[PDB]
Structure formats: structure tokens, C-alpha cells
């Protein structure tokens, strides 16, 4: 079976950014439903089970470019009393629909904390080594939910 | 007077 | 979108 619209595809992968492996493992996803970064999904289109390959995915087809609007300055009083507010530390605010908005602390200057709401890989080009482990048809429930079980 | 935090640990 | 990177 080939990778295609409405297939649930299982891959084993290694994610490299700038010559360093950042993540490694296995995932399954419903193909053609915006469940996987588009560059990788494009590289997977039409592949057979058992196929292995490498794929370079520029930032625009991966987690997207770095959005300057994602960088903001907030007061230190915005953070929990106990928290260590340091570069790299992660937290979340809430969007207008009540959902979590993760952020990373970028810099702390006295009372001014610069945070970044961007995906940590936004604006980075990715390199994948991929193996297609399994391809199957989605169940109706998976199509209704929009994701692999 | 201390402001209600709008940033949460996770 | 996947891969989920924390
Ligand atoms: Cl999925």
C-alpha cells in the first residue's frame, strides 16, 4: 500500500537540525489532513511500506518561519511567584479561545522579560532520515476525528 | 497590590 | 503538527 490521502502511515525517523539529532523515534499520522509538517508529508506522498529515504525540509515547509510578532516583553510579575524565570524556561499563556499558548523565556532584564511564542523550531531548516514502517487505511472514526487513533 | 499572573507553569 | 517537539 502506498502513502496517500486518508492513509494512516507509521514512520521511523531521525530529525536533524544543523548537524545535530534533536529527536528520534516512531510516529503514526493520518495523511492529507494537515497532521504532519507539510514538507515531510510531501516527501512521504506515494512511498511504499518499507521504503527508506532522506528529506531536507526548509523552515517554510516545516514549522514555519520565525514570526517577529511571537516575541514580546512582559513584566516579571506576570510569572508564578515560585518560578525560575530564566532563558530557556518554558511556560504558557492563554489565547482568546482559552487554549494554552506555550512560550520560551528569551531574556530577562531587571523587570522586563522577553518571551517567544514561536515554535522552538520555527525558522530552522530540518533534515529527516525516514523509514515507512506501515501504511493502512484510516477507519471511519479516524476520518471523523481527523487523526490516527 | 499584586497583579494576577497570566503566565502559568507547565 | 507532528513531529511533536516539546
Ligand atoms: Cl494523526
Residue numbers in the entry:
A (entry chain B): 1 to 149
B (entry chain H): 25 to 34
C (entry chain G): 27 to 32
Pull verbatim passages from the article behind this deposition.
Peptidyl-prolyl isomerases (PPIases) catalyze cis/trans isomerization of peptidyl-prolyl bonds, which is often rate-limiting for protein folding. SlyD is a two-domain enzyme containing both a PPIase FK506-binding protein (FKBP) domain and an insert-in-flap (IF) chaperone domain. In order to improve our understanding of the mechanism of SlyD and of FKBPs in general, we set out to analyze the kinetics, energetics, and structural basis for substrate binding and inhibition of SlyD from Thermus thermophilus (TtSlyD) using 15-residue-long unmodified peptides, which we reasoned would be better mimics of natural unfolded protein substrates than the traditionally used 4-nitroanilide tetrapeptides. In total, we obtained five structures of TtSlyDFL and three of TtSlyDΔIF at a maximum resolution of up to 1.4 Å.
Next, we tested binding of an S2 mutant peptide where the sole tryptophan residue was replaced by alanine (S2-W23A). This peptide retained the ability to bind to both domains of TtSlyDFL, albeit with moderately reduced affinities. Furthermore, there is more than one molecule of TtSlyD in the asymmetric unit in several cases, which for TtSlyDFL:S2 and TtSlyDFL:S2-W23A display substantial differences in substrate binding. We therefore expected that a peptide where W23S2 is mutated to alanine would bind similarly to the S2 peptide bound to molecule B in the TtSlyDFL:S2 structure. Surprisingly, the structure of TtSlyDFL:S2-W23A revealed instead a third binding mode where F30S2 and I31S2 are inserted into the binding groove. The S2 and S2-W23A peptides both bind by inserting the side chain of P29S2 in cis form into the center of the binding pocket. The binding mode is the same for both TtSlyDFL molecules in the TtSlyDFL:S2 structure, whereas the S2-W23A peptide binds in two different ways to the four molecules in the TtSlyDFL:S2-W23A structure: one similar to the S2 peptide (molecules A and C), and one in a different but partially overlapping fashion (molecules B and D). Two peptides, S2 and S2-W23A, adopt β-turn structures with a cis-proline in the i + 2 positions. However, our results speak against such a scenario, because both type VIa1 and distorted VIb β-turns are observed in our TtSlyDFL:S2, TtSlyDFL:S2-W23A, and TtSlyDΔIF:S2-W23A structures, which strongly suggests that FKBPs can catalyze cis/trans isomerization of prolines present in (at least) both these two types of β-turns.
